[PDB]
């Protein structure tokens, strides 16, 4: 279960990675921006799950998601967007792009554990 986690906040990456670890997911690769995330997916097509934010320089998460879904290798990759964009207009926008599960920031460590366990369970 190779996961890639993309967020331009170092503290957010910390919390997500720790939470995944608590759930038994240890094979976690990170990226700070969309460009870097895309390079990593393209070069590590064995990646099983993409977890991404939305707002970030160097390609935003919506564009990343569209690009992933347009690639023949990643038609079925689960995509989890974790973002402060809580408005339903944004939710709809992201689901249409190919996001499968949408988790709205901010959360406590425990709430993130609960919401990720819903999607991924334990490993
Ligand atoms: Mg961000
Ligand atoms: Mg937050």
Distance CA 99, CA 116 (A): 15
Strand partners, 101: 80
Token pair 């038609």 is found at 75
- Domains of the chain by range and CATH? 1-123 (3.40.50.2300)
Nearest ligand, CA of residue 16? 2
Q: At 51, phi and psi to the nearest 5?
A: -120, 125
Task: Write down how long the chain is.
Answer: 123
Residue 106 gets which letter from DSSP? P
Q: How far is the CA of 105 from the centre of ligand 2 (A)?
A: 5
Q: How far is the CA of 41 from the centre of ligand 1 (A)?
A: 19
Angle between the 34-43 and 61-69 helix axes, to the nearest 10 degrees?
20
Annotated binding residues for Mg(2+), written as ranges, equal 7-8, 53, 55
Distance CA 56, CA 52 (A): 10
Residue 5: alpha-carbon gap to chain centroid: 5
103: helix, coil or strand?
A: strand
Cα four-point dihedral sign 71, 112, 1, 4:
positive
Closest by CA position to 42, among listed 68, 61, 18, 69: 68
Note whether 27 and 72 are within 8 A (CB): no
Strand partners, 85: none
Query: In Å, what resolution does this model reach?
Result: 1.8
Q: How far is the CA of 80 from the centre of ligand 1 (A)?
A: 14
List the shell of residues around ion ligand 2, using CB closer than 5 Å: 105-106
């Amino acid at each position: 279960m190779k996961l890639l986690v993309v967020d331009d906040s170092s503290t957010m990456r910390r919390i997500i990675k720790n939470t995944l670890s608590r759930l038994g997911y240890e094979d976690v690769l990170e990226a700070e921006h969309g460009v870097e995330a895309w390079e990593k997916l393209d070069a590590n097509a064995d990646t099983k799950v993409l977890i991404t934010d939305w707002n970030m320089p160097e390609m935003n998460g919506l564009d990343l998601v569209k690009k992933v879904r347009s690639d023949s290798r990643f038609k079925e990759i689960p995509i989890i967007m974790i973002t402060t964009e809580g408005g339903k207009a944004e939710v709809i926008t992201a689901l249409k792009a190919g996001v499968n599960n949408y988790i709205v920031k901010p959360f406590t460590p425990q709430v993130l554990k609960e919401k990720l366990e819903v999607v991924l369970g334990t490993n």
